[PDB]
Amino acid sequence: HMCDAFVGTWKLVSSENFDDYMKEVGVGFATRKVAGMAKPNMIISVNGDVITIKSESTFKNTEISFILGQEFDEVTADDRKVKSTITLDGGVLVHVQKWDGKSTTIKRKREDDKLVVECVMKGVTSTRVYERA
Ligand SMILES: O=C(O)c1cc(-n2cccc2)ccc1Cl
Numbered sequence: 001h002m003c004d005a006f007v008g009t010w011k012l013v014s015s016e017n018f019d020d021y022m023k024e025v026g027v028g029f030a031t032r033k034v035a036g037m038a039k040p041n042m043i044i045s046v047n048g049d050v051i052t053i054k055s056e057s058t059f060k061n062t063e064i065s066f067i068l069g070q071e072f073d074e075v076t077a078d079d080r081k082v083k084s085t086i087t088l089d090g091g092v093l094v095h096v097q098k099w100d101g102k103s104t105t106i107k108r109k110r111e112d113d114k115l116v117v118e119c120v121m122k123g124v125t126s127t128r129v130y131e132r133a
Pocket of ligand 1: 022025035038039040055056057060062076077
C-alpha cells in the first residue's frame with residue numbers, strides 16, 4: 001500500500017519554468033520546443049514491490065519499472081542515459097538521476113487532488129501539476 005495515493009492516470013494541467021529546467025539539464029533547442037508543448041499522461045501502477053511509471057504524449061512514450069531504493073538504468077525522454085534511484089521520503093517519491101557527473105532530482109507529491117512534480121537541477125526548479133485523468 002506504499003504508493004496507494006499515487007496510483008492512477010494523471011494528466012498535465014500546468015507547467016512553470018520547464019523550458020529553463022530543460023536548458024539546465026542540457027536539452028537542445030528543437031527538443032525543448034517540442035517537448036515543452038507535450039501534455040503527458042502519467043500512469044502509475046504497483047504490482048507487489050514493483051512500481052511502474054509511464055509517461056505518454058505526442059513527444060515520447062516512456063516507461064520505467066523499479067523497486068524503491070534499488071538503482072536502475074533509464075533512457076530519459078530527452079535521450080540521456082542515466083542511473084536512477086527512486087525512494088519514498090516522508091510520503092514523497094524522490095527520483096535522482098545521475099549522468100556525466102551531473103545530477104537532477106524529480107519529486108512527486110500528492111497535494112489535495114493533484115499530483116505535483118518538482119524537477120530541480122542546481123538552482124533551477126520547475127513545477128508540473130497533474131490532475132486525475
Ligand atoms: O515524458 C515526460 O514527462 C517529459 C520529459 C521531458 N524531459 C526533458 C528533460 C527532462 C525531462 C520533456 C517532456 C516530457 Cl512530456
